[PDB]
Structure formats: C-alpha cells, structure tokens
Amino acid sequence: GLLNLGVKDIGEKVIFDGKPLNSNSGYLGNKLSVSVEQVSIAKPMSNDGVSS
Amino acid sequence: MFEVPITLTNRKFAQRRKLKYQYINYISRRFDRISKQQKKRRRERHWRSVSFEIWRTVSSQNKQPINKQKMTYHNFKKIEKIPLRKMEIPLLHCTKENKLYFQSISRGLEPLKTSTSEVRNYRTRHIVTLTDLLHLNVSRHNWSLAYKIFATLIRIPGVQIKSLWGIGVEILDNLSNSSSGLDFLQWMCQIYSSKSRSIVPPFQTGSRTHTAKFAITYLWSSLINCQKSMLIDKISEWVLTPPFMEDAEVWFIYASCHLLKADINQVIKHIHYVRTFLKICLDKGGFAVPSRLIENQLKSFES
Numbered sequence A: 001g002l003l004n005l006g007v008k009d010i011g012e013k014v015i016f017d018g019k020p021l022n023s024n025s026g027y028l029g030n031k032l033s034v035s036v037e038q039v040s041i042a043k044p045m046s047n048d049g050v051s052s
Numbered sequence B: 001m002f003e004v005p006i007t008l009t010n011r012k013f014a015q016r017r018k019l020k021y022q023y024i025n026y027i028s029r030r031f032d033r034i035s036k037q038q039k040k041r042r043r044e045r046h047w048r049s050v051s052f053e054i055w056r057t058v059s060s061q062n063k064q065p066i067n068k069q070k071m072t073y074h075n076f077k078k079i080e081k082i083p084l085r086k087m088e089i090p091l092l093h094c095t096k097e098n099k100l101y102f103q104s105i106s107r108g109l110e111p112l113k114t115s116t117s118e119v120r121n122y123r124t125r126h127i128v129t130l131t132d133l134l135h136l137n138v139s140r141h142n143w144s145l146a147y148k149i150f151a152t153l154i155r156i157p158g159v160q161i162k163s164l165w166g167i168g169v170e171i172l173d174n175l176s177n178s179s180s181g182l183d184f185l186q187w188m189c190q191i192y193s194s195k196s197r198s199i200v201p202p203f204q205t206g207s208r209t210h211t212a213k214f215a216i217t218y219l220w221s222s223l224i225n226c227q228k229s230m231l232i233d234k235i236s237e238w239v240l241t242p243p244f245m246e247d248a249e250v251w252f253i254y255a256s257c258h259l260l261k262a263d264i265n266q267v268i269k270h271i272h273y274v275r276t277f278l279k280i281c282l283d284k285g286g287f288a289v290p291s292r293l294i295e296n297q298l299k300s301f302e303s
Helices: A002-010 B013-035 B038-046 B073-081 B096-106 B122-139 B143-155 B164-170 B182-191 B212-227 B232-239 B248-262 B265-280 B291-302
Strands: A013-016 A031-034
Touching: B013 B038, B013 B073, B013 B096, B122 B143, B122 B164, B143 B164, B164 B182, B164 B212, B182 B212, B212 B232, B212 B248, B232 B248, B248 B265, B248 B291, B265 B291
Parallel strands: none
Antiparallel strands: A013 A031
C-alpha cells in the first residue's frame, strides 16, 4: 500500500539528549531515533461508551 | 474441592495480605540494609517480573552464577528481630484470628484452611455444590444434566464467566437444541474485546494484551469449521482486521487460512500469501518445526 510505502520514505527523526557521558568531547549524548513502521486503517467501528 | 468461579471474597483476607506484605517489606528492607495500604502491597508485589508445536520455554545458558551461604541462625534472627516488632504495632489492630495467622505464617507454618474453606454460608455452600455437580457431570459425559447445571449456575448473580470452556466443550458435545460452540466462542470474543488488580486472567482477560481463551479458540475452531468443508476468506478478512498484530500465533492462523484456501494464478497468490505470513510470524512466537514442512507442502502445491 501507498501509505506503508509513504511512511517508509519519511524515515527517522533524530534528536540528541546531549549528555556528556564524562569522557570539548565530540560525544553528543544518546541518539533518539523516531520513525514510524507501518500504517493501518481500521474499518469504521462503534465501541459502546467505555469498557471496550 | 475445586476452584470457585466467583470473585473470592470481601472479608479479612485483605487485612491478612496487609500484615503479610507489610512484614515482607520490613524484612526485605532490613535485608538489603545488611547486604549494603493497598498501595504498599502494590509496590511490594510489583517490583518483580509479573516434532510438535511447542511454545518452547526459555532454557538455561546465559543465566547466572553461584551463591554461598548468606544466612546463619544468629544472623537470620538479626534481620528477623526488629521488623517482627513493628509488626507488633498494627497486629494490635487486626483481629485475633489474623494475629495468629500472621504469627504462624511468620513462624513459617502454612495454613491448612483455604480462603474457600473458611468463607462460610447458606448461599455460597450451595453454589459450591452446584459448580461441583457441573464439573462432575462434565467429567462424566453427562452433557444433559451438565447443561442444566451450567444454566442454573450462570443464572446466579455471583458467577463470573470464568467457566466458559464449561460451555465451549459442553454445548459442543450438545448438538441437540441450542446455538452453540462457535456461537459462544465468537460471542465471548465480540463482548470481551474492548473497554466497553487481582481476581483474574490467563483464561479470561481484557484488551491491550493477549487473551488466550475466546480469541484463539474461535480463531482455530472456525478453521475447523472449514475442515468441515473438504468461509475461509471471511475468517481471514476478520482475522484480517488486526491489530493487536503482535498475536504471532494469529499470524500462523492467517497462514493456515491461506494453506486451506490453497487446498490458477489466484492459487499462486494464495501460496505467495502463506509464504508471507509464516515469516511475518517469524515475528517471534515459535511454531511449525521446519517451516520446510509447511514449504514441502507448499511445493506439493507448487506442482
């Protein structure tokens, strides 16, 4: 499907915490990698209030 | 003499679990010391890991190494002596029976009455006999009586549906008069699959993580209603409304739907199809020893 191909194009979103680790030092901290994987669309469904 | 299928009780048992886990915490606290409330019970019970198709276990190989004596007499009684006293305070507020209960569980004795055994009373002792006669009649293949039992049971305002395999086999050997088997199964599934603590699960449960009973039982048994054939694209369309989609075993149910549809380029796409879900069910789970058997079958198909 297009979406699962579409999302595959977006790829990661990277941000750095910036913790020095205590090795000036070129260490940028932990690397967060944010990317989606696959997308699905549920058919229209009616849950009744809460309680699933 | 069998597990009861109603929510255990109100009574004492809470204050007993109080005493128990409170004292537990005082001893384990002073124990890490020397090694250097519903909520107290909650944190306490909390910080702890909570040729055939075997869900193989996790065996010993990268696990751990050996310990050597921690606990002489004179040194255990060290860790024991203080928390037992702090216990002497709220022990002063619980009841005599539970004073003695805590006393004995703390000496390391073990009770020989059960929570069922001691929860006395006209009504519950009657339910106890009702459910016994249920389990007995079902052992006896006396499906008729059995059924009567089950019906008077669930009629009672106390029983939660923890006795479903009760019907799922009972109504199953009762072709006779009642919508049945799959009726119950997919009913259970449809009702208890959404939002719409103790006293729980493996064979009952709610959403967000998996749900043995109703799910897998209707989810194969309908594929057995297709061994009734020699339906499928229905079972795989509404199987094909995931997600929990980590239900790897249901991935194998899906691949099974495709091997049964496969039994011209249509049949190709069905065998391509099963080839896909078998490995997307290498997700993990762990089935089918050699998939090369499934695949030797798929080559008998490839003919």
